[PDB]
Write a protein that binds this DNA or RNA. Sequence first.
DNA 1: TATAATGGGAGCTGTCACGGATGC
Lengths: 111, 52
Amino acid sequence: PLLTLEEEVELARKVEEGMEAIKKLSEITGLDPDLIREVVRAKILGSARVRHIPGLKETLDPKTVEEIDQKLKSLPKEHKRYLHIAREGEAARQHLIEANLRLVVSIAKKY
Amino acid sequence: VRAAQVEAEEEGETVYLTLFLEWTEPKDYRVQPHMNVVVPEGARVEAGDKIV
DNA sequence: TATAATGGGAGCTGTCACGGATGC
């Protein structure tokens, strides 16, 4: 179903803040922000989909995402809080996309 | 409002009650759609804490 | 790169007859 102004602004906001949180989590851990994003995304979507990403300098298999998810869970409370933020931002991203999937149809019918 | 403690003094044909009261006063805050609450239900705050 | 916009459109109408896989 379609998004109420509140639901839209909320999912949007959570996305922006999870992007922020991946930046902060890179600041903290010194790992690559893209690798971070792909790990958070992996665990959000599930193991149903994990595959090698072309920009990533590392092959993204369940072994290394478990390793990096573990080294992420080994954080202080005020840092691991950013892991919870990024997870929420990824889920907001998927829900906002799937919400606005009908705008695409109404726009491509004229093409 | 509740009367925590009650001190009394006798004087002439009366008493004067020095009541140590404790009570809660409400204030409303209207939220707009562009806004978000940062506080759970029934959660206590102090002077300067963020509500919305 | 920033008003806001949120589920498509055809279809095509006059064969005939089998075999062989699928529902009361």
